[PDB]
Design a protein around this ligand. Structure first.
Ligand SMILES: COc1ccc2c(c1)N(CCC/C=C/c1cc(C(=O)N3CCOCC3)cc3c1N[C@H](C)CC(=O)N3)CCC2
Length: 118
């Protein structure tokens, strides 16, 4: 119940490999690498449906700038990114299928890391 203290440099070192695993997926990571601009992309309802957008570059910036206090907050951001994509996109779309592949990759990477951090 009393939270152990995680130093930001320890979270960055431990969790960065799991984020690198996502980024290295090609073609599957491409639509997830940067924040979206709905007006430029032609999806103007995106922020109506997706209340809390999330993307790989934003997660990397949060690790780089010490914005997570505990590892589950990082896991929550990765899964927010996944859940937003499964909510917004149709099941036949590239983004939807790519999201499913990233979730498979992430599940394998994150488990031993979460065990090691405690
Ligand atoms: C869109 O899929 C691909 C697949 C491969 C490659 C793509 C794009 N690009 C452009 C990358 C940037 C694209 C992002 C992105 C774009 C659209 C989008 O404007 N749409 C309208 C018509 O097309 C389908 C949907 C939707 C979504 C998008 N992503 C985030 C997760 C928000 C979302 O939930 N959905 C680079 C080369 C490889």
């Amino acid at each position: 119940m009393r939270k152990k203290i995680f130093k930001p440099e320890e979270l960055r070192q431990a969790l960065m490999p799991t984020l690198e695993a996502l980024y290295r997926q090609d073609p599957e990571s491409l639509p997830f690498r940067q924040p979206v601009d709905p007006q430029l992309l032609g999806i103007p309802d995106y922020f109506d449906i997706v209340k809390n957008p999330m993307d790989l570059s934003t997660i990397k910036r949060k690790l780089d700038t010490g914005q997570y206090q505990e590892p589950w907050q990082y896991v929550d951001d990765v899964w927010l990114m996944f859940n937003n994509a499964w909510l917004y996109n149709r099941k036949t779309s590239r983004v939807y299928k790519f999201c499913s592949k990233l979730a498979e990759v992430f599940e394998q990477e994150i488990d031993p890391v979460m065990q090691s951090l405690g």
